[PDB]
Amino acid sequence: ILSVLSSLALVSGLMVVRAKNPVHSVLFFILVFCDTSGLLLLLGLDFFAMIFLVVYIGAIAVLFLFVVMMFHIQSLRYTVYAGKVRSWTNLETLGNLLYTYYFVWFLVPSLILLVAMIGAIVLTMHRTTKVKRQDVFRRNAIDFRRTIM
Amino acid sequence: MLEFAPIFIYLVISLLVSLILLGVPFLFASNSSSRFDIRFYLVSILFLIFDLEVTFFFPWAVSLNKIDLFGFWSMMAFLFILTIGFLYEWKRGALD
Amino acid sequence: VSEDKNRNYAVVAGVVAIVGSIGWYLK
Amino acid sequence: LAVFPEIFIINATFILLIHGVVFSTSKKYDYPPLASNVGWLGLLSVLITLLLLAAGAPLLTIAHLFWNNLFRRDNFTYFCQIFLLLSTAGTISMCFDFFDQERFDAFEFIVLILLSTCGMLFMISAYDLIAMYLAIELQSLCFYVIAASKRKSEFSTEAGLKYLILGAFSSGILLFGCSMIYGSTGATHFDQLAKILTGYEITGARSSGIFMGILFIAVGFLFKITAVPFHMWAPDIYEGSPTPVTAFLSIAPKISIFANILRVFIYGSYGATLQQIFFFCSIASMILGALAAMAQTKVKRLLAYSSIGHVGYICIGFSCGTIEGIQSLLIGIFIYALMTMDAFAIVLALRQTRVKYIADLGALAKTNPILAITFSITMFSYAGIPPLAGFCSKFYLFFAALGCGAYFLALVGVVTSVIGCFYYIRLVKRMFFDTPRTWILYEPMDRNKSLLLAMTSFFITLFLLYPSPLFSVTHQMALSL
Amino acid sequence: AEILGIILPLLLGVAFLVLAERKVMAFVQRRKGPDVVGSFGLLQPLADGLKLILKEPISPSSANFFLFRMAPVATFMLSLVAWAVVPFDYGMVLSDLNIGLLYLFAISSLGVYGIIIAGWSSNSKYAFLGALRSAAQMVSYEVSIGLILITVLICVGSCNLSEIVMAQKQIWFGIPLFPVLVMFFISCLAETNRAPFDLPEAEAELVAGYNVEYSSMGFALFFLGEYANMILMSGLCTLFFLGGWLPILDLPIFKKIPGSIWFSIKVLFFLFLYIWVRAAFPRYRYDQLMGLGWKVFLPLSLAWVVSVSGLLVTFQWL
Amino acid sequence: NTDITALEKAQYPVVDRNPAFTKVVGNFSTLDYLRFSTITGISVTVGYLSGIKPGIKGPSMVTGGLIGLMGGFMYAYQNSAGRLMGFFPNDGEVASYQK
Amino acid sequence: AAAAAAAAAAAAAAAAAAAAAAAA
Amino acid sequence: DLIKYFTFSMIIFILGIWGILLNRRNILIMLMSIELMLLAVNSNFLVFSVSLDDMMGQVFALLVLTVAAAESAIGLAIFVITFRV
Amino acid sequence: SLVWLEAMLPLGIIGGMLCIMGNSQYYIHKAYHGRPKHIGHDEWDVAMERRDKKVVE
Amino acid sequence: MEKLRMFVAQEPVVAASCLIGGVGLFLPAVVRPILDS
Amino acid sequence: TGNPIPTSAVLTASAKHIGMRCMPENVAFLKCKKNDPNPEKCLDKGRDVTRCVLGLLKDLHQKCQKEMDDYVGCMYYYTNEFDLCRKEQEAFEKVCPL
């Protein structure tokens, strides 16, 4: 029966866009991701289920939870026994491609993660380091020192 | 996937176990005896990025005999870009 | 009898860059 | 090999990024203002990239592995990619003065501009939906950061948030289209896509899945170029940010998107739907711009609306299927870019003036009289007055449009040019004839900004004597697709 | 089902680990630990439990029962469900997932939720910021554990934990990658809090650092969770690096070679190492600690993925 | 698999299709070594000159020289490769007819 | 925060008694 | 059954664009819906890769994962900066 | 000296619990199914199990 | 070099990571092409 | 197990012998399948491979049955996993068919 239980994801997605209390919004966000990972499990894409878990409800909705807590808003099959003699786990059959054949679409997300690092640095350093912690800065010769107030 | 059903029922049976561990104390013992710390957003975004790059490490880790010396060098280029990002974060001083 | 260390390197580099420009047409 | 021109700018960005951070975080150098040292070095990094890309133009197509599975470089891409770097460098040249006046310690801001150029260089040559989306994401992501650079002032940051959401939505909408286009095609490459979509004709041959994707991909692109159907908060982005950052987003992302647009749609898709949507957008953009030029008062916003009106004239070339029309669009993009850089530079010339109305900009007849004539040339170029280069580009767009048969679309463009000309004579009247508004006295700029005006204003007027080279260059690019 | 046969013995394991820690860390300090309650303190865990159960609440407060009365349940359920994929002997894993390792990584990424939620429901600014600091630490030594597992994964073929412990028949990955075991242990020390790395767990700041409504069940469940998370993260330093259930393979006549007994011996070694290293070393202050997970165990983990990938690519050892 | 087969290829007589590195770089004409030398100069001179303002003249000169080395070397490589391969003028066929 | 961080570098350990070791 | 796993993703995407249209006032829900629609196209790529029995779908889904994640990083960082001090 | 055995005893009865964690979920699964668990149980083996339960009729 | 030793003393873990990592970026760079025999 | 019912265990147990013998039938079946994957077009070659392999099993079943009966007991106990009992594998191979 768990097949049609994507209705849970469906209603939780309707919650996040029709909720004024942000805690409920982020909770049903996490719920949408959990049910989407359930779906991606039912399809057998095991790697993508765990990646949804990790890089969504252990990083991204962690971010969103932070933004809520602080900064409150207010029969007939014919199985072909060939190609089953060596079953390729999903990670192996993503790595056979992403790093050798389509590797530039993998070095470009490298640049996108680097731009995300540079961006989170230049944006949210918040004048807390050399961006402004260099010094207040002062020059004596130009300074009036009581000659001009 | 076939082996996911044992953990699928594991979540629910551990829910039951924790509910019993919750109800055990509840039954007994009757009547008579800082504006914002943005570094927690920098640390968080940086974990996000480094876990994305570990996500990219995983298939390259499990499939490295297939990609003989070319997948390795492509991953090392991806990793040199990771290292440039990480050195820009170290020097700029986000690791504090 | 010379300017700051490093200024000399830049002055030498400019001549080698200008020599290259005439050279690029020449060769 | 074959990615070396892109590799150099990415390496140059990394080398500048490491140089800026190590130097900026230096007690020995007293935490110095790297921006402007990253600049000049940043401008020559683009120039070295320009030479490498031009030098390897025959060598660009080195191997099938890069074209078939990653990105394909062609003669059209090379000519526009050369222009993209020149447009980027020209914007940096005017921007250097802004870096000097501002307390710019943002060495990273230059690295973002170079990273954007690398994303834009990859965008022009991207031949796969995945590659185009990923390249678009990088170029926009670098742009999102430049918009929010002035953190102390919320006006730049709030403008960035609207640009960010519009950017995220535009990338997201385009991404959904790729998913639907992928579902029918079974492949993400434009070349494989063209074989499945050649002559699809959603009326002649059924293609429900492909069209569903095409609708999303086309809509996303329009948000990126500030097309009026999706203009949204994009005009707001231009006025809210300071003039120099506004100039960079005004020309380079738009040129990259327009070049990407011709490659993704004309070659890959063949249905009678793509040309018509641009035809409606072109009429609307010129109508919105003409109404806006009269309606808008702030000089910076007016430029954005005049640019939006010009964008509609550019859209007509794609709207008419003729290759001569695609060539006319290219003539327009080059003239609009030269004028847009020139227009931003004249506003940048009055650096001393803080945000001020057109009437305040008036009274330049007595003081800086030559600059006053230069401002008149910039307004005339978008106006379509015949002596200026813009009219010659518009006439080619219009002559192509009449040959394409777009009499209704061509007429509104002439009518919008007529609507614009009246405001421009009124602005020219404002500069010398009337509304001096206090005889305000202006300040000097850098030589590079004066040269940007000198090399462009002379060329705009000189176009009449020798207009043959540009027309020849533009058609070659259109034919190459 | 048979999930009882992996949760009940694990509950007993955690209850007796509180005693094993007190007793070992006491023996270290030249003193017998809990020694009167049971024959050798063996009943002391049951005494701690049966005491915490019989302690009247400070305030009933059963109204707020969906917010933070199920958050310790969540933390504990995660610490217990990461035990499915952990194999104790050949064919003794409860559910052999062909992506087992990544599933452990995801379970940690959800334990982050456990901590953050159970700290936010405590309406104490000091305790909530403490829980956020603890979550940021647990998640900053997770990129380092991630890369350490990428090393032990490069050495192995697949993420299947039974394979990672079957890939060590020739030699445990503790011998060649010993520097990595030291980094996984010093990270598992820091991922969990119980470590030289526990400033958020500084004796006082811990109790006032997880919740406001204790009722005893919350106190026990957090400690039962910390001690199961510890048994788990010590049952990983013994699958990956030590031979999961492999002997030294000398094949003795005295030793009939049981598997689960070897896994038990090794996880006991790593639990004893947890205790020993809690006794003998000062705390890291959470300001040098976060500057050790980024500036020390991430560079030294990245290097190791490039070293164990290189040295295995050049010579075709993959 | 990979192959150096090119679009619009062999417009001039090829000398060595797919030249190996350490040969295509040992083919540097006194013009390439003059292109790799002028680019490194215009990149050191700009690098030092840009750094006069922030006090970083030496190290900015060094990083401009690093950029120039990378760029001018990849340009000299482009030239000597499109010369060895059939892409550029390629008057260095005497080096093959003689050796 | 620009607060002075506790730099854990210093001079090496050298037991420094007073001058009254032998003859006051 | 592919339709069930696609039209459900299609209407998750419609929910995302709907929340985009309505919530132009609140931005955190805007970003919520952004990642929602970047899931409904991501789950869409995965479903269409299982259906077509093609791996390009999953490669593109992984790259969209590690691009939408960086997008959420920069998005929320921009949102935190927007609520200045 | 064997004084450490008193402190070894809690680690023993926590090791005697992981042995039970391992052997319980083994001999429970060895009961429901007449055979031990298969670790490397790829799709080839589920297909062969299907055809096997279909061969014994 | 004097500054190199000053860098491998002050920062041992980023100078023994760029050397436990060189042995990984150096083995397949040169030691693998050497293994042509 | 029992009569030579080609179960999973008894098939993966004799696969070494099914490799040494019955290689022509297997390679012919595979050549057909790689020629065209329609099941009918070499139903005859399917009968041919199944005939020689059922014959090979009945040969292995008739001779050294107890060692074969122990090795298939393995392969049913540990599901076709070779390393788990090399002793039975050697016993069965060593006694009669190498």
Side-chain angles (χ1 to χ4, degrees):
Chain A
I1 68 183
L2 269 43
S3 60
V4 79
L5 262 292
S6 74
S7 87
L8 201 72
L10 265 185
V11 58
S12 43
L14 206 158
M15 186 58 203
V16 302
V17 306
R18 200 214 60 95
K20 265 307 294 182
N21 192 358
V23 53
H24 293 271
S25 296
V26 158
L27 169 65
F28 283 74
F29 196 50
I30 291 167
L31 260 292
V32 164
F33 288 167
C34 292
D35 311 307
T36 310
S37 197
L39 187 145
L40 295 177
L41 279 165
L42 309 188
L43 317 184
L45 307 187
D46 46 1
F47 172 76
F48 285 95
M50 296 330 180
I51 292 315
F52 270 49
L53 263 70
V54 177
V55 312
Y56 277 161
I57 63 186
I60 277 181
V62 170
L63 267 56
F64 281 94
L65 203 44
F66 286 12
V67 184
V68 170
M69 294 171 328
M70 294 96 81
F71 308 89
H72 186 76
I73 294 307
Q74 284 101 21
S75 65
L76 180 62
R77 329 178 40 78
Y78 185 55
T79 82
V80 49
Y81 289 124
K84 286 189 176 191
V85 308
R86 184 173 326 204
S87 192
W88 272 28
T89 171
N90 186 268
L91 279 81
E92 200 143 348
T93 177
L94 261 172
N96 184 34
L97 284 73
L98 192 60
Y99 308 97
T100 178
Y101 280 128
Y102 311 105
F103 77 93
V104 191
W105 313 335
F106 152 75
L107 267 46
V108 170
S110 161
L111 298 172
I112 294 172
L113 299 188
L114 160 69
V115 169
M117 284 180 268
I118 298 187
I121 286 309
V122 62
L123 295 167
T124 62
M125 196 45 75
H126 215 66
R127 318 301 210 162
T128 62
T129 321
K130 67 90 169 181
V131 47
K132 291 296 290 295
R133 294 300 171 174
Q134 52 183 355
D135 185 18
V136 172
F137 273 68
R138 202 52 52 185
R139 271 86 196 191
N140 289 337
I142 188 54
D143 268 354
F144 6 78
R145 88 212 152 280
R146 293 182 183 174
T147 309
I148 298 99
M149 179 186 312
Chain B
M1 194 275 292
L2 181 148
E3 315 105 319
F4 266 100
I7 70 171
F8 283 167
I9 49 154
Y10 199 119
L11 269 78
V12 195
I13 310 305
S14 161
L15 171 148
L16 266 298
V17 161
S18 315
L19 285 192
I20 304 155
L21 277 152
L22 174 149
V24 162
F26 168 80
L27 163 70
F28 294 169
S30 166
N31 217 306
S32 179
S33 309
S34 180
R35 208 161 50 255
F36 49 85
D37 301 339
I38 296 307
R39 281 168 328 272
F40 298 147
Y41 271 85
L42 269 184
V43 163
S44 162
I45 304 291
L46 269 43
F47 153 73
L48 169 54
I49 300 303
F50 274 90
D51 212 316
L52 290 168
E53 313 213 42
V54 177
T55 288
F56 274 156
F57 264 105
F58 264 93
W60 170 80
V62 301
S63 83
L64 196 48
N65 43 355
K66 307 304 162 197
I67 50 181
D68 38 18
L69 196 53
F70 183 36
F72 163 72
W73 277 124
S74 88
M75 190 37 180
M76 287 311 108
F78 169 99
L79 203 45
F80 159 66
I81 302 184
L82 186 164
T83 294
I84 289 310
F86 182 57
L87 163 63
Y88 169 81
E89 292 183 343
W90 199 337
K91 271 309 206 162
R92 176 69 157 239
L95 323 169
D96 282 316
Chain C
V1 192
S2 55
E3 301 70 0
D4 63 276
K5 293 179 179 179
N6 298 162
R7 203 207 84 156
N8 334 327
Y9 300 47
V11 172
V12 166
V15 177
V16 164
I18 299 327
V19 153
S21 166
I22 320 308
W24 191 325
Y25 176 77
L26 202 175
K27 301 181 179 178
Chain D
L1 295 174
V3 175
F4 283 43
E6 283 166 7
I7 286 170
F8 168 72
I9 185 158
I10 294 169
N11 277 2
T13 299
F14 294 166
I15 297 180
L16 283 192
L17 172 79
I18 298 320
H19 122 117
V21 68
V22 162
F23 295 166
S24 193
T25 324
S26 171
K27 186 167 39 53
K28 167 183 310 185
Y29 297 107
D30 173 46
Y31 315 98
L34 266 286
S36 81
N37 186 340
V38 194
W40 300 113
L41 260 178
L43 166 88
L44 177 63
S45 312
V46 154
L47 282 183
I48 300 304
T49 317
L50 170 84
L51 178 43
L52 266 48
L53 151 70
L59 262 164
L60 277 190
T61 70
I62 186 167
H64 219 128
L65 156 59
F66 306 85
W67 341 307
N68 186 340
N69 283 331
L70 320 153
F71 72 130
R72 178 165 315 175
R73 290 198 127 160
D74 69 41
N75 300 328
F76 158 66
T77 62
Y78 147 72
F79 279 102
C80 201
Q81 269 196 15
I82 294 169
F83 189 33
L84 158 63
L85 288 151
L86 282 179
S87 75
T88 299
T91 59
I92 317 181
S93 307
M94 310 167 316
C95 288
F96 285 131
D97 167 289
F98 154 67
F99 303 141
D100 306 333
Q101 316 317 146
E102 232 283 352
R103 293 182 183 174
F104 246 44
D105 45 310
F107 89 80
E108 52 277 53
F109 181 83
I110 294 284
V111 328
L112 293 160
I113 289 166
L114 304 196
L115 252 163
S116 89
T117 325
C118 171
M120 287 185 212
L121 285 169
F122 199 109
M123 265 193 50
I124 313 275
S125 47
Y127 216 74
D128 183 308
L129 299 161
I130 306 190
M132 156 192 69
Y133 154 56
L134 290 189
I136 278 188
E137 188 63 307
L138 195 76
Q139 88 90 327
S140 308
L141 190 28
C142 307
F143 267 81
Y144 299 155
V145 186
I146 61 171
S149 197
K150 283 192 43 53
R151 91 187 74 193
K152 190 172 183 178
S153 181
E154 47 284 12
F155 204 21
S156 69
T157 78
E158 74 83 2
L161 179 57
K162 293 179 179 179
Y163 177 33
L164 158 73
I165 301 166
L166 168 100
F169 203 42
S170 46
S171 206
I173 289 303
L174 177 149
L175 173 49
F176 188 64
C178 300
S179 184
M180 284 320 307
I181 275 206
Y182 163 67
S184 283
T185 314
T188 52
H189 206 60
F190 291 171
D191 173 22
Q192 306 194 62
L193 228 86
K195 295 184 161 194
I196 292 282
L197 278 61
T198 19
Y200 66 71
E201 59 188 8
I202 302 298
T203 303
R206 197 278 307 183
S207 290
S208 173
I210 279 146
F211 179 82
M212 196 175 321
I214 291 213
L215 168 61
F216 289 99
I217 290 193
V219 157
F221 265 107
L222 297 179
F223 278 102
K224 289 293 189 199
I225 26 148
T226 80
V228 58
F230 306 108
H231 83 290
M232 229 173 190
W233 327 290
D236 319 24
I237 308 320
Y238 283 61
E239 197 202 325
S241 45
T243 300
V245 19
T246 295
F248 247 111
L249 50 95
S250 174
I251 163 195
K254 302 322 165 281
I255 285 187
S256 197
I257 298 292
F258 272 117
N260 192 346
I261 272 181
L262 304 184
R263 289 244 300 179
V264 58
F265 301 138
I266 296 293
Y267 164 79
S269 150
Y270 199 62
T273 65
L274 228 5
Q275 64 169 27
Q276 316 302 167
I277 177 60
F278 289 51
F279 148 85
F280 152 62
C281 307
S282 320
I283 296 178
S285 295
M286 298 168 325
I287 282 293
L288 177 63
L291 272 37
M294 310 166 59
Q296 305 316 154
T297 61
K298 279 312 167 184
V299 42
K300 205 189 319 305
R301 181 165 293 288
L302 177 63
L303 283 197
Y305 279 114
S306 145
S307 159
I308 288 193
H310 212 316
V311 152
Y313 292 93
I314 303 332
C315 230
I316 61 171
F318 174 114
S319 317
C320 116
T322 53
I323 317 304
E324 284 213 45
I326 310 286
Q327 152 190 18
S328 69
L329 168 162
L330 300 167
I331 316 190
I333 294 169
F334 179 105
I335 301 305
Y336 153 60
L338 177 63
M339 192 283 293
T340 224
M341 279 183 279
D342 179 315
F344 274 103
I346 306 177
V347 173
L348 275 165
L350 326 187
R351 266 302 275 192
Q352 185 48 36
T353 74
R354 292 274 302 184
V355 187
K356 278 177 197 306
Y357 41 105
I358 302 278
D360 276 357
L361 177 63
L364 214 178
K366 296 292 184 289
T367 165
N368 226 332
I370 279 54
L371 180 50
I373 303 175
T374 288
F375 184 80
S376 83
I377 292 170
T378 299
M379 284 333 202
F380 273 23
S381 181
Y382 167 66
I385 314 285
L388 295 174
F391 162 75
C392 206
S393 178
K394 282 185 176 187
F395 119 66
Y396 205 98
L397 279 152
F398 290 142
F399 136 68
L402 293 188
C404 311
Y407 280 62
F408 166 30
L409 169 40
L411 216 185
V412 35
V414 174
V415 162
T416 53
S417 165
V418 160
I419 295 169
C421 287
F422 135 66
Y423 199 69
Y424 295 141
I425 296 305
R426 185 182 295 276
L427 264 37
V428 161
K429 183 178 179 180
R430 216 155 200 191
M431 201 144 34
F432 323 85
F433 316 154
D434 214 344
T435 325
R437 202 83 172 196
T438 74
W439 302 55
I440 171 180
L441 308 178
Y442 320 81
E443 183 178 2
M445 294 300 293
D446 68 29
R447 181 178 316 170
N448 328 133
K449 215 187 298 286
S450 319
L451 281 182
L452 177 63
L453 275 66
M455 305 175 303
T456 302
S457 300
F458 268 52
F459 152 77
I460 284 186
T461 61
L462 167 79
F463 202 54
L464 177 63
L465 298 315
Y466 187 36
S468 165
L470 187 41
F471 285 30
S472 316
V473 174
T474 53
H475 197 44
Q476 182 141 305
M477 311 163 62
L479 289 166
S480 165
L481 299 198
Chain E
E2 74 268 22
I3 302 162
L4 282 303
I6 193 181
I7 282 186
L8 269 65
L10 176 69
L11 293 177
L12 267 298
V14 165
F16 284 133
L17 187 144
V18 312
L19 164 75
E21 167 179 14
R22 277 153 67 190
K23 187 159 266 294
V24 161
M25 198 192 50
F27 271 58
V28 156
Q29 291 142 3
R30 270 203 303 161
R31 66 178 188 85
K32 297 178 312 176
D35 193 17
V36 62
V37 198
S39 43
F40 297 98
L42 296 186
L43 295 176
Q44 170 72 84
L46 188 147
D48 304 348
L50 201 66
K51 186 265 275 187
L52 285 146
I53 282 166
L54 295 170
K55 285 266 270 183
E56 322 287 322
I58 177 174
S59 158
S61 188
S62 315
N64 40 37
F65 80 104
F66 90 96
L67 310 95
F68 63 101
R69 199 182 71 187
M70 316 313 169
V73 160
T75 50
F76 197 69
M77 164 199 74
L78 296 180
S79 315
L80 264 58
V81 69
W83 268 103
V85 307
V86 161
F88 308 83
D89 188 4
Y90 193 101
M92 294 199 196
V93 53
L94 167 66
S95 84
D96 181 314
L97 293 183
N98 278 112
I99 56 157
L101 198 151
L102 195 55
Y103 160 91
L104 288 183
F105 209 46
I107 293 299
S108 298
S109 298
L110 297 197
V112 159
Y113 274 169
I115 289 179
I116 293 176
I117 284 302
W120 176 42
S121 286
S122 158
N123 295 2
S124 316
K125 189 255 171 189
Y126 190 33
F128 165 75
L129 262 291
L132 207 70
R133 293 185 334 163
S134 159
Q137 157 189 320
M138 178 177 177
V139 81
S140 158
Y141 293 88
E142 208 66 8
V143 314
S144 199
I145 279 180
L147 294 177
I148 293 315
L149 299 199
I150 298 321
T151 293
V152 68
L153 193 59
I154 292 174
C155 290
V156 174
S158 45
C159 318
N160 195 1
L161 269 71
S162 285
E163 170 82 0
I164 293 174
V165 309
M166 266 299 311
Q168 293 156 37
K169 287 280 310 294
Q170 199 65 19
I171 200 170
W172 302 348
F173 302 130
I175 299 171
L177 302 162
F178 189 75
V180 190
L181 176 54
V182 153
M183 283 172 300
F184 196 58
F185 190 67
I186 299 173
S187 295
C188 272
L189 279 196
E191 178 201 5
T192 60
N193 281 328
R194 187 186 176 287
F197 306 92
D198 54 8
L199 177 78
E201 201 187 307
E203 296 155 71
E205 301 178 296
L206 172 72
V207 191
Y210 60 76
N211 202 260
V212 55
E213 189 84 49
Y214 299 74
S215 69
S216 87
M217 177 271 300
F219 173 110
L221 224 50
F222 269 94
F223 315 124
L224 268 40
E226 175 179 331
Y227 300 149
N229 200 357
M230 167 168 143
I231 301 190
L232 164 75
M233 294 302 160
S234 158
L236 270 64
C237 320
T238 182
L239 301 166
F240 308 143
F241 296 96
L242 270 57
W245 39 261
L246 311 167
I248 294 91
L249 193 63
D250 58 323
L251 190 42
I253 299 164
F254 170 81
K255 173 66 161 179
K256 69 177 164 303
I257 314 283
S260 47
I261 279 179
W262 275 105
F263 178 85
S264 165
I265 280 181
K266 300 172 195 322
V267 63
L268 296 197
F269 165 58
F270 271 94
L271 286 187
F272 170 56
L273 190 45
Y274 265 83
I275 324 297
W276 190 11
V277 166
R278 162 139 187 267
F281 291 142
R283 305 181 163 100
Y284 242 128
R285 191 140 73 57
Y286 187 74
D287 305 337
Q288 318 148 355
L289 190 164
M290 303 304 279
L292 226 75
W294 297 120
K295 301 172 145 163
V296 168
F297 303 120
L298 190 47
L300 271 175
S301 291
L302 272 180
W304 280 92
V305 176
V306 296
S307 197
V308 194
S309 86
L311 201 143
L312 293 194
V313 167
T314 81
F315 303 99
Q316 293 294 330
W317 301 128
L318 282 167
Chain F
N1 262 347
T2 171
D3 46 338
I4 200 68
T5 193
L7 272 171
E8 317 166 37
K9 79 166 150 60
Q11 188 178 3
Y12 290 60
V14 307
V15 169
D16 175 287
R17 171 203 204 77
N18 190 15
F21 197 95
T22 76
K23 155 168 183 181
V24 53
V25 76
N27 191 259
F28 276 169
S29 158
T30 59
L31 165 61
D32 303 333
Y33 270 127
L34 186 134
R35 290 169 148 150
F36 161 83
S37 300
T38 175
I39 280 180
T40 44
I42 299 166
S43 305
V44 152
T45 275
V46 161
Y48 168 106
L49 267 165
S50 57
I52 68 186
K53 173 190 177 61
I56 314 165
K57 53 172 57 64
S60 158
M61 169 181 76
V62 170
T63 192
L66 287 190
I67 281 185
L69 258 71
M70 200 37 170
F73 170 88
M74 288 158 60
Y75 185 18
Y77 189 102
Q78 276 209 347
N79 277 176
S80 88
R83 163 168 323 116
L84 287 200
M85 278 166 296
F87 289 103
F88 283 159
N90 180 22
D91 287 348
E93 322 200 28
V94 179
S96 158
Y97 280 164
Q98 182 194 69
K99 273 204 170 182
Chain H
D1 193 16
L2 155 68
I3 293 293
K4 170 193 173 191
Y5 281 145
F6 150 69
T7 58
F8 278 178
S9 157
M10 169 86 195
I11 66 160
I12 292 182
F13 175 86
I14 294 313
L15 289 195
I17 193 167
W18 197 59
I20 282 290
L21 290 205
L22 316 182
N23 277 257
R24 282 207 206 172
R25 292 173 296 180
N26 184 208
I27 294 321
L28 180 79
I29 291 310
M30 280 304 257
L31 265 294
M32 222 71 61
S33 65
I34 290 297
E35 314 301 352
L36 203 75
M37 52 190 300
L38 259 50
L39 169 136
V41 64
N42 196 8
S43 178
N44 199 18
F45 273 120
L46 297 156
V47 168
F48 276 138
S49 161
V50 177
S51 177
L52 305 168
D53 200 299
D54 174 69
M55 191 41 92
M56 302 323 291
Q58 289 168 27
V59 161
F60 199 12
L62 177 52
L63 308 171
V64 176
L65 269 176
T66 82
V67 162
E71 180 64 63
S72 200
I74 299 305
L76 293 214
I78 291 180
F79 196 39
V80 153
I81 186 167
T82 300
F83 287 152
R84 66 184 182 277
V85 309
Chain I
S1 171
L2 272 296
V3 58
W4 55 277
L5 271 191
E6 174 189 342
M8 163 75 189
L9 189 44
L11 288 177
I13 64 161
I14 197 187
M17 292 298 173
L18 270 76
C19 276
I20 293 314
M21 284 164 62
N23 287 80
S24 67
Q25 79 197 31
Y26 170 81
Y27 289 102
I28 296 312
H29 169 89
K30 192 178 164 150
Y32 289 167
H33 316 275
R35 71 182 83 183
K37 183 183 268 291
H38 193 41
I39 47 154
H41 202 257
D42 45 351
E43 58 196 295
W44 169 272
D45 276 304
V46 299
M48 290 205 76
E49 266 187 350
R50 295 212 292 254
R51 82 161 282 272
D52 202 356
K53 75 155 284 304
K54 209 179 55 63
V55 158
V56 300
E57 330 289 354
Chain J
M1 185 185 174
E2 54 268 13
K3 174 64 192 183
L4 198 70
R5 289 166 309 184
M6 287 184 39
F7 176 70
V8 186
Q10 297 171 19
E11 281 271 2
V13 302
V14 63
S17 157
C18 306
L19 189 157
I20 303 301
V23 146
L25 290 198
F26 165 89
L27 286 168
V30 307
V31 172
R32 174 71 177 283
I34 274 175
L35 258 55
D36 58 4
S37 59
Chain K
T1 289
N3 39 359
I5 43 175
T7 48
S8 53
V10 77
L11 264 191
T12 323
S14 44
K16 261 71 192 154
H17 301 308
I18 313 283
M20 277 161 59
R21 268 84 72 191
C22 278
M23 180 170 189
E25 283 53 30
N26 286 37
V27 65
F29 189 95
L30 280 186
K31 192 166 305 308
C32 171
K33 279 287 172 158
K34 184 185 193 301
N35 165 68
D36 51 325
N38 186 276
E40 281 88 334
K41 322 316 305 182
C42 41
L43 200 66
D44 52 337
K45 295 166 175 179
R47 304 140 169 184
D48 199 319
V49 56
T50 304
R51 157 171 62 251
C52 84
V53 163
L54 263 294
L56 190 43
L57 287 183
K58 196 60 148 196
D59 161 44
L60 295 178
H61 163 81
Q62 277 160 359
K63 73 177 182 183
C64 91
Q65 64 180 20
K66 293 179 179 179
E67 295 69 18
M68 180 277 300
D69 278 317
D70 269 359
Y71 191 46
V72 295
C74 269
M75 308 309 271
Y76 174 90
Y77 192 69
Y78 305 102
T79 84
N80 312 107
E81 196 72 359
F82 281 82
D83 204 314
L84 264 297
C85 62
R86 289 261 191 279
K87 305 131 192 192
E88 277 91 322
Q89 162 170 327
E90 292 309 340
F92 160 62
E93 194 172 3
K94 177 196 54 56
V95 289
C96 282
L98 277 303

